[PDB]
Amino acid sequence: KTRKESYAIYVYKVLKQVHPDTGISSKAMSIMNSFVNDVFERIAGEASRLAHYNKRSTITSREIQTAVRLLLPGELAKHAVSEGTKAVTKYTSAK
Amino acid sequence: RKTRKESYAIYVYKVLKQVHPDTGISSKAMSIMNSFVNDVFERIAGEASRLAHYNKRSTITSREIQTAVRLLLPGELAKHAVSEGTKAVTKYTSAK
Amino acid sequence: AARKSAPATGGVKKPHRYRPGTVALREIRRYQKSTELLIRKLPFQRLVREIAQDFKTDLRFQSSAVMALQEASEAYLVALFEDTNLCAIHAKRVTIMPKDIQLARRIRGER
Amino acid sequence: PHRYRPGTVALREIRRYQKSTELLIRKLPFQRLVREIAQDFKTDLRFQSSAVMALQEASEAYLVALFEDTNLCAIHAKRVTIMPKDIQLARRIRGER
Amino acid sequence: KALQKELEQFAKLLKQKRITLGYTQADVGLTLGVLFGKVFSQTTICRFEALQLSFKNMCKLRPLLQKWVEEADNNENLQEIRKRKRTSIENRVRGNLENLFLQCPKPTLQQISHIAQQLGLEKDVVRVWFCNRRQKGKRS
Amino acid sequence: RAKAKTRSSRAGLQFPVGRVHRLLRKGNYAERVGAGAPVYLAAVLEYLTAEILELAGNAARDNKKTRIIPRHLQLAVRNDEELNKLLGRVTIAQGGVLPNIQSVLLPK
Amino acid sequence: RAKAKTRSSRAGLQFPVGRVHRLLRKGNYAERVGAGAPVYLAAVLEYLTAEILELAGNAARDNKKTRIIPRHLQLAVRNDEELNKLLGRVTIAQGGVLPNIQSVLLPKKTESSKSAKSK
Amino acid sequence: KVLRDNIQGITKPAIRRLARRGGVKRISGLIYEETRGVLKVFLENVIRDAVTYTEHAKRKTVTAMDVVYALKRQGRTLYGFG
Amino acid sequence: RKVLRDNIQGITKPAIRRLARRGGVKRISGLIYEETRGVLKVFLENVIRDAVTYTEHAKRKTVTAMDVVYALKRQGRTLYGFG
DNA sequence: GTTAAGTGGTATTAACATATCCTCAGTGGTGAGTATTAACATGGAACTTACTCCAACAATACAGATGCTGAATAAATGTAGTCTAAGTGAAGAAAGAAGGAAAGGTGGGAGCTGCCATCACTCAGAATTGTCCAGCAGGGATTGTGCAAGCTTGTGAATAAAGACACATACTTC
DNA sequence: GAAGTATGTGTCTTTATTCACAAGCTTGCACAATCCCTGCTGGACAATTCTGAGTGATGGCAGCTCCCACCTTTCCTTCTTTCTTCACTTAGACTACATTTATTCAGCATCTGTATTGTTGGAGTAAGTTCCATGTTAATACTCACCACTGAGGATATGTTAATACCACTTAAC
């Protein structure tokens, strides 16, 4: 069979972090896979048109940050912005 | 000189002079009609862009545009819009 | 005024009967705890195929395609009955009437 | 003197305001309200004239459309008076509450 | 003689008609007042139906009740649509008046007016109360 | 060299096929754009434009006006069942509302 | 050639930065994609996943279950004011509804007064 | 008479169960015919779009993704089917 | 440097009454005006917050008509006539 | 001198304050009865874990497109003041709408019974979809050319604004 | 119910206002011609998955009977909202100037795409296992009709005493 990629192992990695002694059903993981795919298109779609509005050819972490501020509701937006900048800070400092 | 800004104003006016030869249009209504064309452009082109992605296609063709028209325009609008779109492609193909 | 009657009654043996609303409230709790589909699958599957005949003939349906339609259909109807219930309570009733569905659908933007 | 009945003038106002297209809120009081709200988001903010005008056209279109939904909730409850409970129901069914 | 038993039979039937007609004894007194002018208190009707009043009083109230029972049966709605005022004496006034006794059993009207103004009672009320004080003190 | 003929003239259109082609190409919609896609899209855009302008010019004539204003566009869109559905979540500036009064509010 | 290190490990992320970069490049979003855009997007996607799974894992413990099912995802999302706004137009299959009966439908508690009586 | 129109397969007990999950305590007898009409309109819109995706793909079978895509196109995103 | 406060009260009761008239309302409760002012404030806060977000992303300090138009479109409230 | 009225003196009488009692309403307490919840044992299917392998990711260099910083500056918004009339705010009188109470009736609920249509399962076939491979044509890239479209000016037709006249409707009177 | 009266809206005319339409200029982008190549198409073929049929078991549905709580109508009270008036307070307009900002170049920094290579993370498939659904049982909690208890207000019975009423004595008038 041809390979079909999904976020199943990454959602399971995150689940084993927050809740070590907890599993997830295959139907729930199908829902969690759809959630990550859906939010990905929402942020990437908003970031794509942010570049179009500003006549930019590149999608950067600033477009992603602005799309997160536009889409996520408040406390989610400021926590996700904190997480996103923390990872970009760690990524740049590393190499 | 100010930078050039493209709009459908001259094309909306040409379409107006066929349906209503003696009727004019104000610049505020022309601005609303320009926003209508741009809004419908992003809807059809955006829907057609998703159709190519769903079917693992790298090309937007008149078949993707036709399906987008049927998905967005309601009822009798879609039937006439498909008729006009098909008639233009047929006429365009026969020319060159 | 003189509005009087005879309050005669009696009872020897009577099978237990619940008042009009005890079972209805019990059903609300039962079906809000559960997550299963409330429409029968075969009758719904026939309806989906009947509707699709208007659009294309000799159409085939995946099993999950009909299941996806059923999950969306009951979610739409359950959420509509939540808006319909609010309109009935707004009009100082507990019975949902067809005008409550029409008001709920009109405000949503479906009418 | 001459007095109209309580509801004759109201119906007259309905006809004239549904026949016109002008903005029904005063421009300066609305512009000041716009600048006050924006202060919570960014200090020393400027606005174009059309940026405030676009906000007013959208704000009044939103409020007029909400009163149509609010009116239907009043008539549903066998009333002609729109009450705060009707605005709350209309906004809840719309999905804003 | 047999007037006793005839009154008793009339009173029993009177109780039956009153209970059948849905009238309270206070309502009976009100009806007697609005149909004759001599309104009677419900205590008198109680003592009648229980046959407590004296014989002369028994005969005296026989005719009024006869007329009421013979008349009220026709229509009640229109009927539905002069007490011997008897002011009470409160205990401190009673004690003060008793103090006024044991020294002057029969005061003059000149003193009676002063007594009335002192305790805020009507002159006729104080005079009749004085007379009945003398009366009950002369009983023994 | 041959004299240029615009792709609008080949398709018998008023809307620009060449400009619509460029907007499709530069709008980040697909890797490639077919030859008939701009022709089909410009024909649909031209039809939808003529649909509104026909209904708006009629509403302008019904008001004894020979010039379309935003009110006439609002009247045209809201009085057409299908155009009102296409533009259901769209606000037209300076258009007002339809003159609709509920029947229970009218005098006896 | 140096030892390979995933861009997820550089940022300290469980989610794939390299795969998110590929989905951005072939998703027809922009002509170019920066190096920080997949890192930022993967970190945001991972945070949202942890937020839902934290609440859904709490839900599983209330029902004494050691495995998240779609019911717990629905309970987690609908009981969070902010996840419910993000997923307000989203239907979770086999999720059900929040248990909620309007207070006017509940039975009248025992009580009785007396109006004017003429009997 | 036995049920004839397919829409009639959405039985009154089935509609009552959907109202119970919606928190409805008392149901008028005219609700069921109204509810069947409401569902038929919803299904027509979704199925018309799901088939439109199918004929574009040059397929004869309606897949779960066509239903999911049709639902998303109407602002009714459904999770758990792909 | 200027500061503003108490401007929702500048949305006067007569102005709210006119909006209800265009909405077809014949009779208005006395508590509608306070409810309407809160409704408008919530709506305006959401649109302006998105409009300023578009403005600060563009590295600008003036809010343009497009920022409002983009913000309104993001809420499903497309506005024709301003660009 | 006789007769009618006033004055007391004592007997009857009838109403007050409070003591009892009738009757009706509110609790509720209560067993039966039904349904939901919790404990506990068990099998299976659905999960987690451990192996191939292979396609996608990372490391490495480099070219070139993209974005940055500073300068100057024109464009644009803000700020303040002046004036006039359009709109707002407060008040007062009253119409009629909202809401409670009451009654009636009917429609929906709860429960019962019989049966048939749903469900779970199996199978057989055929219709459909997926994969692989060749290939070629449609689309991108490039360059040169010219002409369509945008911007800048300019003016006659459309629209707004009075202003008077003609209704059309509303509301009180007869 | 009409007549009459006052108010408002609409209609036709005249006149000034304004704003849309066309002419004139330049610039950038659309077309024509060319080459290159890869995405899309058509064919063949395996395989897979959906439709149609049959079957047995039983539970969910349909139709039914009560009957009662809910909806609807009617009537009445009240108090909230409307309509009108009048003083006055900002909004609108408009100048004028100050201040900020958005745009434009220019040079250079740097970041991303592209190509190539090597490996390793992730998907698929298989074994390993344990959580959960299902059952049975028991315990607990809820509902509902019956039995009863008792308190409240009105309505009767008492104790008791203001109030009148009947009678003997004296006193005033003709």
Residue numbers in the entry:
A (entry chain H): 28 to 122
B (entry chain D): 27 to 122
C (entry chain A): 24 to 134
D (entry chain E): 38 to 134
E (entry chain X): 140 to 220, 230 to 288
F (entry chain C): 11 to 118
G (entry chain G): 11 to 129
H (entry chain B): 20 to 101
Task: Show passages lifted from the paper.
We turned our attention back to OCT4 DNA-binding domains bound to OBS1 and observed interactions between OCT4-POUS and histones H3 and H2A. The tip of helix 1 (residues 159–163) contacts the C-terminal tail of histone H2A and the N-terminal tail of histone H3; the latter is also contacted by small helix 5 (residues 213–222). The dipole moment of helix 1 and negatively charged helix 5 together form an acidic patch on OCT4 that faces the nucleosomal dyad and interacts with positively charged histone tails there, mediating additional interaction between the OCT4 DNA-binding domain and the nucleosome. In our structure of the OCT4-bound nucleosome, histone H3K27 is in close proximity to the acidic patch of OCT4, specifically to the tip of helix 1, suggesting a potential electrostatic interaction between positively charged H3K27 and the negative dipole moment of helix 1. Acetylation of H3K27 would neutralize the positive charge of the Lys residue and would be expected to affect the interaction between the histone H3 tail and the OCT4 acidic patch. The H3K27ac modification showed only a small effect on binding of the first OCT4, which directly interacts with the H3K27 residue, indicating that this interaction is not required for stability of the OCT4–nucleosome complex. However, binding of the second and third OCT4 was increased with H3K27ac nucleosomes compared with unmodified nucleosomes. Thus, cooperative OCT4 binding to OBS2/3 is increased by H3K27ac. H3K27ac did not alter the sensitivity of nucleosomes alone to Mnl I digestion; however, OCT4-bound H3K27ac nucleosomes showed higher protection from Mnl I digestion than OCT4-bound unmodified nucleosomes. These results suggest that OCT4 induces an inward movement of the DNA on the H3K27ac nucleosome compared with the unmodified nucleosome.
